[model samples]
Target: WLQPKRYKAHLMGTTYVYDFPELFRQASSSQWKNFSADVKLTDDFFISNELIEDENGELTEVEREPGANAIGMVAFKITVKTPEYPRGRQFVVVANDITFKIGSFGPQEDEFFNKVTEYARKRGIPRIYLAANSGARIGMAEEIVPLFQVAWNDAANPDKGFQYLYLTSEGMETLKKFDKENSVLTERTVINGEERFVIKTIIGSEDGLGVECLRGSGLIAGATSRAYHDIFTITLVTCRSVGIGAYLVRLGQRAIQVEGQPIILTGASALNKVLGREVYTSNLQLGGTQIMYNNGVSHLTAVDDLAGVEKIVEWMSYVPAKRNMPVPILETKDTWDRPVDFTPTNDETYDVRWMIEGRETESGFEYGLFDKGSFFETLSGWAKGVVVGRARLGGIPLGVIGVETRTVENLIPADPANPNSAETLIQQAGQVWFPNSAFKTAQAINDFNNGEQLPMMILANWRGFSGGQRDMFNEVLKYGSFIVDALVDYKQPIIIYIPPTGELRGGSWVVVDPTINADQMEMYADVNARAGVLEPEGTVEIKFRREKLLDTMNRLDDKYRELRSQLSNKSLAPEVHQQISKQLADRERELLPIYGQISLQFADLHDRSSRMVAKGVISKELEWTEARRFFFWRLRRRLNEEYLIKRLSHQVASRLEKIARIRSWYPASVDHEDDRQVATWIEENYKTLDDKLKGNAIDGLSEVIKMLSTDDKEKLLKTLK
Candidate 1:
C-alpha cells in the first residue's frame, strides 16, 4: 500500500506543512482510497469577518479583508487504504493550520472543531487530530497601532517612560469619522502642553482573544472529551502546541508526537520572565519528546509527521471501524497455524518484546503470535515492567500485555532545595509490580476498553508487587487495586494467559482472576507455567512443618520406621521406649533443613497447570509452541459468540422493557452485576423476559431521581422542555 513507485511522495523532506491545500494534496496523493472528492474537505462554517449590529438594529458583516486571520482549521472525511484495511476504513480528520494565527483557537475554530467531532461521533468513526498551534488567538487593534503616541513623564529624560498612550490631534481628526462605528476606546485629555485623545485600553476588542477564547477552548475541550468517551480520539503534535493547544492534546488522550515539536503549556520565554531567570533555554526544553514521551503523555514518538500519521493508521486497525462494531479482521500473509518462534525459558532474564513481536535472528525476523510488523507498542518509555500495545491475532485486532523479565533503570529527579544534589538512577526488578507499572497496567486496560474498544490478551508472568516499606508508602496497593478495578469495569472479552515458564502468584493472581468480572474474563496457562498462593520456596516455609517431616521419615526410611515401631511397642520398658523416641526426635531435627529442600520441590509440583485445571483456576492448558494457533481460534470463536449474543438480546430486551413499564414497580429486581448477565438471568427466570417490575425491588427510583443536584435538575428540565 505504501509503494512509492505507484505513487510518489512530495512531503518527504518536511516534518509538517501548514498549508491546508498542500496538506490535502499529501493526504490525497496516494495514501487513502478517497481524497480527490472536493467535498471531502470543507470550512463552510468558519468566517473571518466579525458580524455586528448596524444602526438599523440589523446584523452586518464588518469588512476588514486584510485584517482577518484566515480561519485556522479545516475538516476532512476520508478513508486510508492500508495492508490491514485494504478496503479502506473511514475517519474524520481535523488539522490545525499553524500558519493561520499560529493555529490559535478563535470562536470560529472552536465551533468548527465541535462540529467535526460531532460528525465523527454521530457516525461512530474515529477522529484524528493534527494539533499544531500557539493556543487561543490574541489579537490587537490594528487601527490604533499606527496613530498611537507614548506620553513621556520627563520630556528631556525619556528613560522615565510614559504614563499612558495617546492619539495625536492629526490621528484624532482622521479617527473621528470611523471611530464612531469602529472599535477603539478613548477620552479627550490635555497633556504635554497639547490636547490629545487618551487611549483607555491598549488591547483590541477582538472576538476570542482573551476571556472569550477561553470559552471556546473550554467548549472544544469538552467536545473532545465527549468524543473520546464515545468514539476514538487521537492527537498528533506535528509542530508546536502551547496553552490551550497543549490542553487539547491532553484531552484527546491517545497522543503521538514528532521529535522536534513541543507540546508546552507556556513558552520557555514566558516561564523565564515569570521566574526572573533563564531556567529554560528553548521551547523544546520545556515539553520536547524527551519530556512528554517519558512522562506518559506522548504514547509514541516519530521522526516526522508522515511517520506519526502511519502510527495513527496502525492504531486504528486494532479498533472497530465504528463504535459498538466488531473489530476489523483482515486476511494475513503470515500463516496463523505456524508455531511461535520465540519461547521464554525459566530463570533467564531477557526482553519480553522478543516473545511478543518475534525475535530478530540471522534468518531475519520470525513471526510471533500476530501478523508481521503489526505490533505497535505504546507508552514504550514508561512502565517497563508491563508492556502494553495493540497487535493482531490471525488478522483479528486485540489489545496485548506482556510482562518484562529484566531489571529496569529509571531516573530520579534532583532535589529542588539542594543545588549540589544529583539525579540518581533507581533500579527496579522486573516481574514485580511497582506503583508506576501497576498504574500503567490499569491505565492501558482502561484505554483499550474505552478508547479503542478492543478485546484484551494479557501474557501474565508476575511475582506479585514490591511491597517493601517505601513502596507501600508510595501507594503500591492503591495502584495494584486499580488493575483489578479496571478488569472488573472492562466490557470486552479478556484472555489472561500465563506463558511458558511464567509465574503469577499472590496479589497478581488475585488481580487477574476471572471471578472479578466472571462473564468477560477467562484464564489460560501454558503447561510449563506455575501459579499458586505463594512461590515454592516460600510455600514450604509455611506449609511443611516438623511433623510433616517426621511423617515423611516414617514413610520413606526403614530404620526410622523400625525405631518408631519399637518406641510404640507395649512390651518395651518405659526407659527403652523413651530412648528410642529421643533418638527418632534427634534424627528428625538433623534432617529438618534437608527436608525443607525436598518440601520446596514438593510444593512446586503442586503449582502445575494440571492442578490449576483440576482446581478450576484456569480454563485450559496450552502448550507454548502451539499457543498462537489455539489463541487465534479461541478469540475468533469468542468474538462470534459475543456478536450473536448481542443480536439475540432484543428478544430479552423487548420483554424487559414491557415488564418495567407496565408491571408493578421497580425493574431493578432483575439487576445483575453485568448487563450481559442481567439479560441472561431475566431470560431464564421469565423466558423471553418481560419489562414487569417487581415490588420487592422498588426500593427506590423516585429517590434516585430526586437525588439529582439542582444543576442536574435544571439540565434535565431543559432536555424535557
Candidate 2:
C-alpha cells in the first residue's frame, strides 16, 4: 500500500526549506479572518547588537538586514472574536522566524521574546509561543575567510591535507583594519623571502556568541516561568526547537508539539560525532512527538500547525477568557434531565470516553454525561489507563477523570540490568491503579487546579493500587499518595462518583474520601456501586474463619449433630469414640472451604451503596439513568453558590443570610417533595420547576439575591446554614 500522502520533490540545485510565516497563517486561519484584525506588534524586528564594518572583511554577514537569517523573531497580538468570547480574546503570539538566522535566539531575539511575554502577563491574557529554532546563535570570525590561503602538501593535484592556513603580506592589512589596538592573533613567518601571517586561530566576531546567547536565553526562561504562574502559557513546536528552545518548551509546562517537529538540546549529528559512530540519524528520533508525547513532555500532538492552533483554542475554552473572569459557558443543545444512552454493564469492559463524550451513530448522536463534543482529552499518549480531559456539563466546563475498564498495554522500558533489552509491553489490568496512571491522575488534578481552575468530576472505579514487588519498586505507593495530595490541595468543588457497577476499594477509597477535602469535595455512588474495606472474597477470608465455620455447622447442620451424638454414646468403647471423633473432624474440614464461598456471597450483599450511605461514606445513591439530570442542577447550583460568595464577599458578614433569601423563591425540599401524599403529582411538577429554573435569569446572581425580603431571609438562613 502507498501508505503516505504528503510528499514533495527536492531539486538538486536547492535544499529543503520550511516557510514559517505560512505555517503561522495556516495555524491562525478561520472564519473570523476579515472581522478580527491581526496586528504585527514587533518593534525593531530585524535588530542586532553587533557593529561590524565592511572594510573589516567580515564575510559572515548573518545579521545583515537584507540577509536570510536577519529577522530573528516576530510578535503578534491576535484577537480571536469567537461566540464564546464576545469581546474577543486577546493573546500574544511570539514565534521565532526560523527563516531568520535558522530561528536561533541571539541577545536581541531573547529580549524581544521576554518583552512579548511580559506584555501578555501585564494584560492578564494567555501567551502562545510558537517555537521553531535551531538553538543559540553560533557565529564564526569570518573576516579572514577569503584572504587566508592554504599550504597544501601536494601542489599538482592538491588531494593531500593542508599543512596550515597562511595569509600573504597584502592579506595581512585586512586583519589590521578588523579590530582596535591592531594586535592580530597571528604568528609572522618568512616563507620563500615573503612575509605571511600564519593565524593562531580564526578570530572574527559578533556580540551574541555562544555563551552570550545563553545569557539571553536565561532571561527569557525566567520570564516564561513567571508568566506560567500568572496568566496562562502554552507552547507549540511548529518546527524543530533546539537547545534553549527545548528548555523553554519544558518551562512553559503546557506544550503541544507538531507531528514531525522536535524539541531537542543537541542534534543527533553532534552526538554521533562525539560518540565516534552513527548511532542516531535524525533529530526527530531524539525529541519528536513519538518520544516527547509518550514521556509526558508534550501533552498533545497534531497533524500540522492548523490542527495544533485549533487544539490550543479548544484548551483555552475550558478556562476563563481572561484571568479571574468566569469560565466561558457556551450554550449547548444537549438537554439536561435526559437518560444516558451508553450504559455500562457489570462485567463488560467499555471505553470510558463513550460514557463521557458519547458516540455518533447512523440514527442520531447519543447523549453522554457531558455535552456532545466538549471533551478535550489531554496527556492521552501517556498513562493510557486513566482518561483526563476538559468537558462541559450542560455547557458548564469541568475537568473529567475516568478510569479505563479495558486492559491497557503500557510500554515500559526494559530493566536496567539488561542493557540490550527492548521495551516491554505489560498489559495492566483494568480497575487497578498503577504507578504511571497514578502519577497521571495527580498531574491532571494539579493542572486543573493550578490554572484551569475548573470543577472536577472523578469517575472513580479503581479496586486498589498494585503492590507487587515490581510495582512497589516503581514507586506505586508514592504516586498513589500524590493523588491524595492533589485532591487535598484542590480548591474547586470535586465530585467523586462511583459509576454503575463501579468500585472504590482499600487504598483507592482512602485517597478519594470526601474527608480529605470535606469543604470542597463530595462523593457519590450509583445504586449498584460496590465499596468496602476489601472485596467480598478477601473480606470473607478474614471474617469467616475456621471457628465461625464450625459454629455455623453446629447450629444449622443436623448431620453434624447426629455424628456428635454417636461420638458421645456411653455404649461405645474408648477406641470407637476416638474413631468417630476422627471421622467428624474430616467432615468439618470438607465443609469449611464450601462455607467460606457462601460467606463471600453474604459479604457481597452488605457491600452495597446503601451501606456506604448508612456509614456516611457517600452523600447519596443515584440511579444511572437519572445521573445526568441530577448532576446538572447539582453542579449548577453549587457553581452559582460559590460565585455569589466570591462576588458578594464585601458583605461577608451577612452574605450567607442574604444568599438564603434567594432560596425562598424556589425552596429545594428533598424531603417534602418526595412525601407519600401527592408523590406522583409533586414529582411531575418538580421536574418542570427544575427544567424552568435551569435556564432562568439567575445568571445575574448578585441582583437575584438582592431581590428578597428580610423575614423570609431570616427563616431561609436558619434552615439553609
Candidate 3:
C-alpha cells in the first residue's frame, strides 16, 4: 500500500514531477488502511499542456498543444482516532504539489480546491490546508499580444474563432464598451481619481480568457473563505507561502507556521526589483516566526513540517469531531487525586513550566498537573508572556491558559567598574500585556469557540499591563480588548484560578474579568494569592488615604513624632518607656489594617483572597495542593449536568413530537429520525436500580414469583391484563 512512485504533471509551461506515493504516505502515515481506497493521484480536471522532445530525447523549448490530466491539487481523505476521540474523525487534507510550477493556482486547480472544500463542508469534517505555493499563475504579455491585437470583426465573428457565445449579447456589448472606453493596448487605468496598472488583466482580456480565469480564481477565493468559517479550517505553512498563499493561511485564523518559514505577499526578488536595490533578503527575514507570530498572521509555530502536522492533530484532539458532538474525554494513566509533587512559594519566582510540566525528576523529566505527556502548548514559542494549550485534566480534555511570571534578564553593556564581560546584565520581574501575547491568547479563545465546547481554565497571574509609553504605544488596549471580547464570546464553562503569589490587578483584571463572562465563569484564588485594583502603596495613595483620611494620616504622623520624642525622654523611667512602646505598637497595628482593609471602618480584610471572597468575586479560597483536585471535581459536576440536560432535552423533544403526531398537528410528510431513539433513555432511567434498593427486597419478590411457577405467572398476568 505504501509503494512509492514518481508521477509527471505539467503546470505553468513546465513539466513537473513528484513522487505520488511518497506524498500520500507522508499524509496517510501508518494509517494507510484508513486512507480512502478511491484516492487517485491525478484527475481529468487539470489541464495538460505537454512539452515537446526531440528525437534524440533532448527536450525542445516548445509547447506541444493542450491536453487533460488529473486534478492539480491532491486531496487525501484520512482517518484519525485516539482515546480522546474514540469515535474517531475523518479529515480531507488538501495540499498543493509545490513541484508543479511552485503549486501555482490555475483554473482547474482553483475549481478542484473549491470542490475539496465543498466536500469537507458537506460532511462537517475539518479541512486542513498544507499550504505552500507561489500564488495564482501569472501570464506573459508576449503570449497575449496576438489576441489583444486581433480585429474587432474577428472577435465579433463566431466562425473567425470568436466563440461569441462565451458571453451574453448584453455581456458582449459591455465587453465592447470596455474595449472602446479603455485602451486594450495600455496597462494603465484611471478610475475616479486614482490610477493603477492592470498589465495582467489587460493582456489576458484580449479574448475573454483572462476574465474567465479570474472568475475561476474568484470561485476558489470564495470557497476558501466560506470553508474556513463553516468547518475547523487549519493551515500549516510548511514552506514558502506567498501571494494568495498568505491570504489562505491568514484567513483560516488557525495557521501553524513552520519555524523559519516565510509567508510573504511577494518574493524578495520582485521587491528588490521594485525598490531598485539589491535587498537580497531571505524569506525568514521577511515572514519568519519573529514576523508572523508577533503580527498575529500565524497562531502557532512548529519546529518543522512534521511538527506542524502533529500540532494540528494535537489541537483537534481537544475539539469535537464536529460542532454537534461533545468534547472528548480520554482515559489516562495519571490519577485524579494524585498530589502535586512541588509547592509554590509566595516570596520567590518560579518557572511556569513547573505548573504545566511539574517538578524536575531524577531523570530530569517532569509531569504536569494534567495527565502525563498530555499537555500540548499551542503558541508555545511566539508569545513568552502568556501560555495556552490543550491538555487532559484527569483525562478530561480542557483548554489551559496561564501567564508566565518568571523574571527575565539579558546582558547589556558591561559595567565599567568591573568590566570583565562585554555587557552588563539587566533583569525585570514577570508581568503581562505584551501586544502579541494578548492578541494570541484572544485568538486562541476565539479559535476554540469555533469548535466544540471545552472547559477552559485560565491561570490569572499578572500585575497589569507593562506601565510605560512603549507598551501603550504598541496598542496594548486594543489587544487586551481582544482578549475580553473572546472571553465574552466563549460559551463553555470558564474557570479562572489565581495561584499563590499570583497577582491580578488593574488593567489585567479588567481585561480578564471573569465577571465579563460571568454566565459560564467561575473564579478561585489560592489562600496566598493576591488581587486588587492597585497594590497597597497605590491603593493608599489614591483611594485609601484620600482627602477624608489625609488629615488623619497627617495627625498620626505628628503623634508618631511626639511619641518618638517622648520615647527619647523615656530613659528617665523604664516602666513608662515600656508602656509608650506598647502604645506605639498598638497604633502601628491599627494603622496597618486600615491600609489593607476593603472598607473605611477597617474590617480585618488582610489579604486579597479574603477581599475577593467577601466581595463575592471568587467562588472559593483553595490551597495550592488541592487546586487540581478541586478544579477537576467542579468540572466533572458541570459536564455531568450538561450531559443530563442534553439527554433530557432530547427525550422531551421526542415526546412532544409524538404528542403532536397523535393530535394530528405534526405533518405526516415530515421525517423524524430520532423518534425511535428512546430505548436508550428507558434503559438509562428505568432499568437501573437506585442507591436505596437492596438485594433482599429484590430477591423476596423474585422468590415468591419463582415459587408460584409457570401456571401462577400466567394466571397473575391474565388477572393484571
Candidate 4:
C-alpha cells in the first residue's frame, strides 16, 4: 500500500510541498524539512523594471505594459549539489526579468536552457524539467529556431553524454525528438492555443510556396517519431495542440488531460475544407484526446492540468534519468505474489500497452515517441488490412509492423492537401512493390538493430499476398516484393512469431517465413503456425480437384475410371477399390489432419510453453499471449461466429451457382459452352457476394506456385535466409 502524508498550516491551510511553488526544487534538493507553525512573506515579489532598448541605434528608456507571454514561461535549471540533481533533477520558476518581451525567450534564456543541458552532459548529469509553456517566442523565431536545432541535434547525438528531457506545453518538434529516441518519456506536455495557417504567395507561383513547406512539415513529423522513442513523454490536454502540435501530443508515450481539454489533429478550418465536413475543436478528424485515446492513440486521460502534472511527477519517479539506471526499489504492504499471468486481462480488450508493461523485465520500462505519429504505420489508409507501429521490447526499440486482415472497407479517400497521402506509390517494377510500408518498417528496424537502436518484435498475422485483377492493375507484386527484400536485407535480430491461425503463403511467403535461417531470424508459432504455399481453401481446390482431375482428366481420371470399372466386372474386384480408397484418405489426412494428432500435439506444446515460460525458457510472454489472444479473438469474429459463417455460406452458394453457368474456353472439352456460360454467370453475380469475401479462389497450387518462377522463389528464400 502507498501512504499519503498530510500536514496542515494555520495560515494558508495546505502544508504539502507539492502544493507549494517549490515542488520541482524540493524534489531535486537533497534536503529534509519538517512542518512549521507559521510562515510569512513580504511584497518583495514584484520588481520595478525599466526597459532599455536601442531606437534606431540610440539608447532609450521605455515603460512596459502588464503581461503577454509571461504566464507561460518558466526557467528549468539543473543542480549538482544533491544526489538527485547529480542525475539531473532540478526546479522550475517563472520570472519576468528577461526584458526582451513578456517572458519570451531571448539569447540569455536560450543559453540558460542550453547550458543546463551542456552542464549535465559535461558532468554526466541528467537534466530534469518542469515546464509550463505556450509556443516558442513568435518574434524571437530567429533565436528560438537555433536553440531548438542545437538541442535537437544534441539530443540525438548520444556521444554528447547524459540524456535530457522536457515536460511542458508543446514547444519545438526538434526538442521533442530527443526524448522519443532516448526512451525518456516521464515528462508531460500540454497543448493550448489558437492555430493559424497563413499562406504567402512567392513569385506568384501557386505550387511553389505550399509544396516545400508541406514537404518540410512531413520531414519534421517523421523525425519526431524517431526521437520520441528515446524519451518518456506524456501530454496534458489544456486548450489545443492542433495540427503539428496535436500530432506531437499524441505521439508522447502516456497522455493525461483535464475534463474539458481539447486536442485536435488538424485545425478547425482545415478539417472543414479538406474533409468536406463541419468541424469543431472537439471533433477534428474524430481526434479529440478522447477519440484518439479510444483508438489506443493516447495513453491516459486526465481531469485537469494540475492533476496532469501530479501524474507526471508520479510517473517520472519510476523512469531513470539515463539508460541502465536502477529502478527505485519499493516496499509494498501486499504479499508478494507474482502476477497470475504476465499480463492480467482485466479490461478484456486487446490493449497492447498492458502487455508491454506487465511483461517481465529488469531495466524498468520506457515508452518512446510521445509526439511524432508512429511512422511504422506508413501507407495506412491506402492498405487498410495491415496495422503498423514501431515499438520496443525490453529497452531495445525496433520497427514493428503486422498484418490485420479484419478491417473496415479498404478505400478511404485521400485529401490532396495532405502532405503525405496514406497510400503507396507504385514504381516501374510493378504496383505492389517492395520497400513500401513493410519495407519501410524493415529499414527502420535494420537501422535500429545495426546501431541506431535495437531489434524489433514482429507480430505477423497474414493471409498471403493481396490478390485479384485490381491488385494486378496496381502492381501489388512489386511493392510486396519490396517488403520481402527489405526483410531479407536486415542483419538485425528478428523474432518472427506466427500467431495461432497465422498462415504464410504465396510468393510473399518467401521473405516472411523466418524458418529459413538462424543468424538474423527465427520462426516461432503459438500452437498454430501454418507455413505453406497457400491458404487451406485455395490449396484444397488447386491440388486435390484441379490438378488430379480438371487439368489431366483425359490422361488419368477418365481413363483410369473406365479401366477400373471394366476390370471390376472381371477379377479386379474390391481389392483395388480398397487400396485406392486408403491412398486417397492418407493424402487428405496430410492436408486437413482429420486424425487431429498435430493439432493435439501443438496444444500440448502450447501448455508446455507456459511451463517453459515459468522456467524462464522464454524472455517474455507476449510471444504467446498476443498470439493466443489474437487467434481466438479473430476466429470468433471472422469465421467461427455464425453471422460470418452465414454470410460466407450465402456468398459461396451464389458464386457456385454462377460458376455452374459459366462455360469453359477449352475447345476440345465437351462442356466448353457450359463453362463459358458459367463464367458469364460468375461475372454477373459477383456483385451479390458478401462484402467480406475474397473475390476469387485460386484454381490450383502448381498454377499459383508456377506464377512464381524459380528466380522469384530463389530471391524470396535468399532474403529470408
lDDT of 3 by residue, 18-126 (tens): 2322333343342222223443433221221222224763322333222223444655555544435444566667776665556777776676677777877887888
Ranking by TM-score: 2, 1, 3, 4
Residue-wise C-alpha lDDT for candidate 4, range 1-721, written one tens digit per residue:
1013222211212222223234333432212121112423222321222222244522223344333222222223322222222223322222222222322333333334333333333433232332222223333122123332111225557667643323232333433554332212233323244221111211211221233434433443453354334433344454444454455454433445444444564446766687776534444345454454433444445554445545444444333444323322222221112221333222333333233333324764322211112222322323334444443232222445555433334223344446587754332221122223444444434333321223345555554454667655656667666555656655445666554444455555566656443335645544434444554444455544533432333243444345434544545559876775565544444434322333344333433334434654332333444443332222222111223334455555443343332222112444432423333343454454333255534558446766797989888679769
What is the lDDT of every predicted structure here? Answer: 0.75, 0.75, 0.63, 0.38
The residue pairs found clashing in candidate 1 are: 655-690, 655-691, 656-691, 658-691, 659-690, 659-691, 659-692, 660-691, 660-692
TM-score, per-candidate, Cα-based? 0.75, 0.75, 0.66, 0.38
* Number of backbone clashes in candidate 4: 63
Which digits, one per residue and each the tens of the lDDT, describe model 1 over residues 1-721? 2233112212222233323324433543333332123333234312223233357633334554322334677565665454445545677777776556657888888877887788788889888888877788886677777888888898789999888888877877766666532455678898658887788865553566577788888899999878878998999888787887898888888999889889998788888788777767888777888788877888899887667776776677677878998888765566577998877777676677878778778987766767676687998978777899988877888889998888888886664334798988878888899998998899899889886999999999998999899789999999999998899888888999999878899978989999898768999999999999899878877898778888998888777788887775689888887899898888777777777888989999999999999999898999978888878877775665465445445444443453333223215674322434443444454423232312134558556768999998899789879
lDDT by residue for model 2 (1-721), tens:
1111012202111111223333433433442342235634232221222212235432111233322333477665556555466556666667776656667899888877887787778778888888878888987655666787887787675887778888887777665566521333678888779886787766455567667788998999899878876787898888788988999998888899889888898788998887777867788778988789997889999887767777886788788766767767876667675888888887776899988989777998776788887889999898888998999887889899999988989676553234588787888998899998999999889878765677899999999999888899999989999998998888778999999979999878998999898768999999988998899988878987777877787777777667777975689988888888887788787777777777888899888999888988888898887888778777766665555445445433464464454344344553322223223333445555344445347668557556778887777678769
Cα-based lDDT at residue 353, candidate 1: 80
Residue 639 error, candidate 3, Å = 2.1
Candidate 4, superposed: residue stretches over 4 Å from native: 1-226, 229-239, 242-244, 247-259, 264-287, 294-300, 304-456, 464-493, 506-520, 542-721
Ranked by lDDT, top first: 1, 2, 3, 4
Residue 481, candidate 1: C-alpha displacement in angstroms: 2.9
Assess candidate 2 and give its lDDT: 0.75
